[PDB]
């Protein structure tokens, strides 16, 4: 017998199957088991606070009205064009901003019915899910991206969503990200919603992303430290070398400003302060104070042996004072961003 | 009895229900109560003057032709595919530039009919609403974003829109914005339209957004002030140090110009003047005048004891005159932008 | 009687109404009166030469086959889903690159039929209309944007388009533009097309846009003038101060180049010369000549009393010669761009 | 008689017209004459190698099965909704990456049938056609854009495409391009394809685009030449002026680097060398050699009358040697890019 | 006889053809032979890790139920509108993020049936395929782009995909890429998938892309080397020339920083270190050490004949030491990136 003809007998008007009535309409709720396979992951943007995924979604549930025993085959396949003749759960993604299905060649959907009445429903789709980001410690920050699966109009006494026991969420190997690193550990939660109407089923997954630091370390932190160090060689130059010392100080200030201005074009645009901003401001303050040191030294010396000793004392003190304060600032800055980060 | 079969009897040709005829076609107008739940908020742009939202819209009204008493159930659910068989209000958003519905998995729409005839209609959609912006005080500015709900072809004697009493507008917790802060207070208005045809119902909501200032303060205002201060140390250098003083002045001017040029790439593009532009121009004028001070001083001295006293008097006067004028400008600038802002 | 049932009798097969036959098929042409209400205006781009509008379009014409007298009501409303059962003009926008209708909630369309047979047809749509731009005087330029309404396949002996007498075009209050100013005066034209087939009806509107100048004046013209002025203080420095004068000249040249390079990132990208480009080049030429003046002066002096007088004469002449030529250039530049602009 | 009723008799089941059978199914092939009218032209990009057009396409062919003599009218118009009931050629654009039709108001399509059986089919559509570009001589380059019209599944013994004799291709007046100039001369070709199946008809048009040079000349070539000239004034300064000469040389190098860095942001991004790159590198090499000249001169002089003569000889030789080599390079560079360009 | 009427007899209800039943439903699997012709290739982006293609896909398989002998014609063509009445393989692209078909003029699809029952199915479509990239050696890197063809719901005992023997993959001549070079060699693989359900057929192709180096060599590597060389001329200047030597060193540092900042805007944005970053950092370290050399030399000399000899010894050693270390670094850097690259 034709499988299509058998499916017609199973789900036609003579059978009386109603696609708008859920299975077990009188008694216990329907239990749906879900799996997610992630094919691609990326397009993480802070201007819109969202990311893009391409996933495989599989749902399994039992429909006692679809049980059959006459047909020898143990499974039956349904045409994607007739999927509206069967009951399906009204799943939707809560934090979703855009989605679509895939139609290249044939429609990317599959539905299978077994002898006992179990239904397997696997579909492929692309999502744009929103995720808030903090960026308060931007060079050293960890972000969490979630994905919520919810029912639209069924309460907990009608529909229940559960994760699989073996492997709910899997990620294809070889995926890379230009800016982040996706950790292998994932969390499965129960974010049940409580409204006036009642409780609504909802399951959640969490992804942890860590940002790499090599480019920032080699392109922003090291040159700033080198410029700050170069600003210290003024204290080792003779005090009667004003056209050299003043020029060196002002050119170090200019170099610091050009470095900071160049670094701004390749950073996220936010209105609040970040750790790299704090570092940049402190380096600018250091190279700014280095010039006032020599300004104070030149005035005291010109004032008319005691005067020329006091001017030299300031240089000898500064030679050891400036690196010590810089080191104290460095250790304070690094411990609170590499330890106080959980 | 099947709920779908009962709905067919209620809204079929035998019943004679007409979807193109509003409820109470002869007498009083229809009253519609509206709720809005905001899921996401962002994508605020000044180039296009618009923002993006993802909302839940709920409408409630009474239809006496849909009252039923035979069916034991107190509520009935309608299939989203047959929503064209029932009368719905012709609501639309007046300041909308783009909208779409959501179809991932099942269509994201719901319609419920109660025994007395009340109808609940909840749908999910994404909007692109336009909002004019001023940006005349750009670092310290407050913007207001509105959302207008209007009827397309029904006058006030046929259709009336009202807000809920309990909670018209709600916002999901945890929403963040890269540039603005959304205040918790919202306004509900009655922006009724008066045309030649007649009065048309319209309700409005207002959102207040405040821009943060930490990044601008730490990256634009402070370095400019530091450069202006550095330009003042020329007055404390010996007047016979022309290769030092001239070089310091011209390098401070160059540093100011590089800072201003670097800051321009990360600002909104408008054709009118802003407060940050005023600040930048004043700082440039100060560092420009500092060099002319020394130009005047070098000429008077070379002219051939009275001459060398007059040159020193200018330096001694400038040492106190320049910071005083800068302080006066600072307090004048800050009070009119932090007080005269309502 | 049901209005829908009456409309069925009026426009059914028993009536014999044909939607593919224009009114007055044998005799005089159909006269259509048009109104346009503009809701939003913006997204003006020079890379693609186009702008975006959101408008309300209303058309009115008389159909003698739709006259009715039995029904007491003075007006009848047609369902948007059945709009294909009535004859409508084949209007289209000639300079249009993209358009779409609005479907949020219900379709944004309306059709009304009166007793005498008059038809009112109001619809809402979004356009992307193309407009060529010159940008030859870019800081001080006026652009004109047009909007053409044309018939696709009807000649002047079948279809005629006319503007309203009272108010063809209206603009909603409160619209702002980030770069331009929209003048309140509009033009109504008759841009009838003449082809081999015959004359085709076409009406036109014109919008005048003026660009603001405050940002450009405060950020490009003033700093360049300040740098040019700073380049003149070399003539007031002692001629035996080569490490000061040469450094000041070359640093002014460098500052001019940095200002010009920074200003380029925020300007329209075209391949022809603009007024701001002319100004930038002239300022660079001035600061370039200022250094050659001192180069000539240093050589004549070293050559071995008559020689040291000739060198001083050049400085004394230049002190008055350079600002005079700059002033002459300034007045010549400004009069031809603020007067010869119509 | 109704024209629609006559068309029904002409192309109904009683007539037996088959839309899947080409005219003259047994004998000679069908000859189709094509016209193209271009409404807009632009959006030329090198990152994607494509351009955008909005055109009117007209096709004419003879169908002997559609000849009529009973109806007095000499022409008949077909409804755009019933265009699938008639045979049309399967034309498509070979180098097309994206296309769509226009539906604002009514569908922008037209089909007319004459008494002898001739068919006129005019439609409006938007294309995104791909064009490879070289950019090897980027400031002075000419690009050619093509447009291929091909049949999908008909060989030369079934379908033949021909251009019109009078005016195949026309361009609307007033079109402007921000970067290129469209020449008035166009080419018509026969790019017939030869495959295993057989010969397939294909016609081609070519457009020639020339890039303007005013902006590049006034903003890149002239300032570089001015900086190179400024680097030559070191040879006219006294050899015992090291803090002036060294500073002038290094500042000219820095100015050259800043100019080159600023110019890079507004150029096409390719991985191969361009003429502007060659010019930039040569200018940098010149300003680099100018400093080594003075480095060599200072060492020879300090070495301890014969020594001080040799140092002066180098300066006197360089004063004439450097501009001569620069002039030779200039004429060599310009002749091979303005003559060897065909 | 009409070919459409013959096709109706062949694939109608009287024939009993079922489009949901694969050929040879009881026995051996179906063998499908595939060809791919690439029309365009480009839009390679590292922010989204994907590329765009426009291809022709051809599939051939044998259907014994479609064999015919009555009709004299050796081939029959099927209408694209009725393609759902025939069985087609459920091919899909595994690494695909977006796809669409082409409808300009007629639909771009073709299906032919021969006498023995063979089916030829050629269609045109556009893809957006994802490809991970490394960019760890960014100036000198080779990337591989794949394209996977897979079945959605058929195991290896039902459906098998094979490449053609003669020419599976062909590329149109004249294709260019702004950044890469496409090698002429391609690979054909068998990437069969093993799941819990069973084995699924899958074929793969690989494309090798090489990045050109001319622009990077002429714009980044050469100027950095020139600046490093210019930093070495300090060792040939007299040690008592502090205002010259210090200024030259600090200006070389500033020039290096400006070059590095300018080069950053035109590079891919990643968070890990690249070869160009390593080169930039080493050049900055060299120009940084050159200034400390003179700082050490000036202090030793001022300390108060033995002292003035030790200071000169450092300069004489550095004159040969610095270029030697630079050369060693250069050869080490180039051999490990031009040899250790496979
Ligand atoms: C769906 O799962 C729930 C949870 O296991 C089932 O509800 C339980 O059913 C068992 C019967 O074996 C009862 O003993 C439990 O008390 C039920 N749980 C609760 C909280 O009441 C439910 O039966 C399942 N649905 C179906 C159709 O089997
Ligand atoms: C919709 O609301 C309006 C406003 O309350 C109702 O109009 C009023 O109806 C009451 C009857 O209880 C009258 O006493 C008032 O005079 C009415 N207001 C006005 C301004 O005339 C209207 O009845 C409501 N619609 C329905 C169907 O109940
Ligand atoms: C549409 O408008 C035109 C222009 O007014 C009408 O044509 C005129 O009709 C009057 C009749 O009252 C004649 O006296 C004029 O000579 C006509 N103008 C021309 C140029 O011939 C036309 O009648 C209108 N259409 C309809 C249906 O009334
Ligand atoms: C389409 O055009 C071709 C080319 O002119 C026609 O083929 C020619 O027909 C004439 C008959 O007048 C013959 O004398 C020529 O020998 C034909 N050319 C070739 C190359 O064989 C063809 O007849 C035209 N199609 C129709 C339907 O008229
Ligand atoms: C599809 O191709 C496969 C592989 O060649 C065919 O399977 C083989 O069929 C031959 C019969 O000529 C057997 O001798 C081989 O043992 C088969 N291979 C295996 C691995 O069992 C298959 O018959 C082809 N399908 C059709 C419909 O002809
Ligand atoms: C020493 C000064 C110089 C700059 C200062 C920082 C500037 C701005 C901020 C951001 C603010 O939100 C918390 C304090 C903090 C982090 C300051 C801490 C103290 C600080 C590091
Ligand atoms: C002291 C000068 C220097 C620059 C000047 C400003 C420059 C431009 C503008 C914008 C104009 O719209 C109002 C006046 C205002 C704000 C000026 C006020 C006075 C001012 C602050
Ligand atoms: C004095 C020189 C220096 C630069 C010159 C301009 C440079 C380029 C152009 C553009 C050209 O199209 C017309 C002449 C014009 C406007 C020149 C006019 C004369 C000019 C202003
Ligand atoms: C004199 C030197 C300095 C730079 C050199 C050019 C640098 C790079 C290229 C690109 C190459 O593809 C052909 C040679 C060419 C064009 C060189 C020609 C000779 C040249 C102009
Ligand atoms: C000599 C120093 C200066 C900078 C150094 C490099 C800086 C950073 C990296 C990236 C890291 O992942 C491997 C080592 C490597 C490549 C270092 C190798 C040694 C190095 C070249």
Report on the structure:
The structure is a homopentamer of 342-residue chains. The first copy, chain A, has 342 residues and is an alpha+beta fold. Helices cover 32% and strands 30% of the residues of chain A. In chain A, strands 1, 2, 3, 5, 6, 7, 9 and 10 form an eight-stranded mixed sheet that branches. In chain A, helix 2 runs antiparallel to helix 3 (242-264), helix 2 packs parallel to helix 4 (275-302) and helix 3 packs antiparallel against helix 4. The longest helix of chain A is centred in the C-terminal third of the chain and has 33 residues, at 306-338. The first copy, chain A, is rod-shaped. At the C-D interface, strand 4, strand 5, strand 7, helix 3 and helix 4 of C face strand 1, helix 2 and helix 3 of D. Bound molecules: a molecule of 2 linked components (NAG-NAG) (5 copies) and cholesterol (5 copies). Residues 273, 278, 281-282 of chain B line the site of one cholesterol (CLR).
